[model samples]
Target: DLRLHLLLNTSVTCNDGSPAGYYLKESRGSRRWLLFLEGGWYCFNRENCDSRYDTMRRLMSSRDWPRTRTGTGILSSQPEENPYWWNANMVFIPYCSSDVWSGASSKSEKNEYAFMGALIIQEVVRELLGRGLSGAKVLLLAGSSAGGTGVLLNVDRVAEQLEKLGYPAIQVRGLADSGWFLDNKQYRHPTEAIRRGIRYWNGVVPERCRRQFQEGEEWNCFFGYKVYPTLRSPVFVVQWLFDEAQLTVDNVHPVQEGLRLYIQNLGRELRHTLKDVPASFAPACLSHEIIIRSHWTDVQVKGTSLPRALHCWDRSLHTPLKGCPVHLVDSCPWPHCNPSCPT
Candidate 1:
């Protein structure tokens, strides 16, 4: 099996319009493949960009990032650690463009950033095809937070290209981890933020894709709930009803009672949002993301682990996902568990 290899300054470029890198861990004999898109919020202009200095920051410096050598969560190389996708050819695509991998504007001559997220994925796919992707049988396009939203927005496009390239037999699947971004107009500011993001990112793909589905829906592509119904490929959205991202960064501070009420409403919204999806796993945890080692095994709903539920969905192809709630998340506990996670 090929160990983790960092592909830097190869062909693709980052937001700063410089060459960037990706981490690849090739499988030995399995034709199956996995792609994980890293998530970090984006900035189109200067002042807004300052917020991301060193918070795991942007993926513009992929090689310099901590996971460049060792991919955490589902990207773990050890079978004992990852279990599900250990034998799959894993590729980690870092997020530099904050547009959730849907910014498709041409390079600008001005110093202003265009956030070439759409181009980034295009370049990465071309590179992977050059490797041995044509022979692959299965591919899991998964991501978390911004990366998860990126997966949802771009999976159909990715699948369409693969089929157009004569790889019809390839089963391209997607998992949206903690990418449950809803446009809450009456309740939160994220709706307004996402609408503004569309303008900043110059998310042409979002405009185009959304128009293709519902011509009147103009919430921008940042809202995953709106985009979920339009995806052509099968997507399993893994979300926490009380996602930390929403609770903290999205300008929400709730007390104990507020949390339960929020969770109740959030669950209702997610049910409606993910109704179009093939499968879903929801747990009412305080934190966000479950693709990581400790959380993957630790978070369970209705007696089923998150990874196990995902595995079950991947294997239930012909049956077409028996139920919507694979692992239903009722009342949940939010205890920090990463300290005990396997390395």
Candidate 2:
């Protein structure tokens, strides 16, 4: 499990010109693969990218990545800690391109850094095929935060690429946690940042979703709700009803007057936005990210925990069930209303 793989191919270099890398834990004879992408916030412009390189260089460069990484939560090998896919080949991809895994540019006269987040994924998949993925039955591409957005932008591409490579039988699915960001104009817009990111990083969004937007508004494809309807592959969303990231961007703090109303409206909006996603777990908690947490199993919606909901999703994929509890959204009207939520 103490295995780290630095790509010998320099084409996938990180922002600082260091080779991209990932940690791998292989389970012999298992045909399942789980690639969990690490999430760090992104920088849209050069000023911020420079600041990021100065303050959090690791997120922008793989120069100092550790040789060994211990799996936790979903990546844990112990069945008690990770109930499903515990025996699968697990891969942890660190984020180093400062592009939310969407960039497709290289270093140029105008840009000082190489933005190859999208290429890194393509390279990783190609490399894995030689390792053990050629015989893979299922590949669960999961991630949190920005990396979760990465899943949305890349899942269909992964499936298509694999199929074109003659691996038509492989089942590829996505699990996006805390990445269902809203572009609510009523509040401060995260949409603006995404708009800037698309141009600055030369972002590569899903073609189908991109085409749906107007010529200038193609960035809308980056929003989960907008892109979800266009995806060709199945995905399970894991999100907190009152996501901390969204609250932070909108400057909503706990105990602020009328915060309750804002939280309630947010919950309502999230529910309405996710109405079409058949497999999702949205807990009414004042937090963010779940699948990567050690207490992931404790969060539940309507008495069905996250893991259980995911299990039901996997089952419904193979067998048709009249009432599978896959679409799990907390009906509570307030934040922190779920008893299972961490206090």
Candidate 3:
């Protein structure tokens, strides 16, 4: 199943303006499409971006990638193995721009670095419409960590285009894996790293958003609390209460008090972000990245696991369910989880 195919669209390229592509796996006659945006943090500036060119997944043509196809977690093609999206058309868009689908460039940088992440997404969509995706009935735009953050940043734009281009009736949704990046906006404190990323990614595309943030507050648009209100599609957020990512993000030195505070703040903010979302699952796992690792099978809250919750939520678009709005898994008590869990 040489599922991996380099997107023929030449417009889609990497940060260094090098050609980039996607890996696609089709399930016979299914009219559904699911795209997973790969994630790795971005380089916020000049020296970093250039230095990053040497490593950070090396910005090269898709053909240069050694790995062919992916059959992990939700990408599994086996019907019984991955019942959730087993029959859907799946696309794995690799991360090379380091922009989380937020960068924009107005010129052709054939010989220089151009963070064309935002453009690459549209390019992929354009190509898909020509390749059996225009008639899609369901669209699942998903990702985790920075990819998850990418989902939040670009889901609305992608959803809007799909609808306008003939998939108007498409069931569009999203799931941010450990992507619930909340800032200390409530406390008048913003995380410096995210602020750096916002600048590095160059605006995170706040131009078309329904609402606007203050000038320095442009980075504010990246937060789920502020951006969720502008989204047209319904998204399910799967995050951990004791998210290892967030705990490390603000504290490079690793402080227990900071970790606990992050968990507390996340719990409060998530209830805010997930209020309108179709049933979210926030387990108290002392970890980050649930969907990326496909922890859906065993990870549970009370008695509800991610797989079960997803099925119910998916059905809600048709049958509608009650009391499934929010499923916050109680925290993983310190001694209970694994050794050195996020606490």
- Worst lDDT run of 10 residues, candidate 1, spans 334-343
- 42: Cα error in model 1, Å: 1.5
Model 1 over residues 223-283: C-alpha lDDT tens digits?
6776776667888888776677866654665357765566557656765665555578766
lDDT of 2 by residue, 10-53 (tens): 87888878899888999877988999888887998888899999
lDDT of 3 by residue, 1-343 (tens): 3255555765667765557777787765898788887877777666777777666645423546755666666776665556577677888888877776787753253335567777777777778777787778877888877778778888888877776876777677787777776664332123565578666655455354534765666666666667766676777778775566665664522447755565566556655655565557776555655564543466666666676787777777663566553445454443225332233
Q: Is candidate 2 or candidate 3 better by TM-score?
A: 2
In candidate 1, the residue pairs with backbone N, CA or C atoms under 3 Å apart (3 or more residues apart, or in different chains) clash, namely 42-98
Candidates in order, TM-scores: namely 0.83, 0.96, 0.84
Better of 2 and 3 by lDDT: 2
List candidate 1 segments past 4 Å from native.
1-11, 50-58, 61-67, 185-189, 206-209, 212-220, 254-260, 318-343
Question: Highest TM-score: which candidate?
Answer: 2
List the candidate 2 regions with Cα displacement exceeding 4 Å: 186-189, 254-257, 319-324
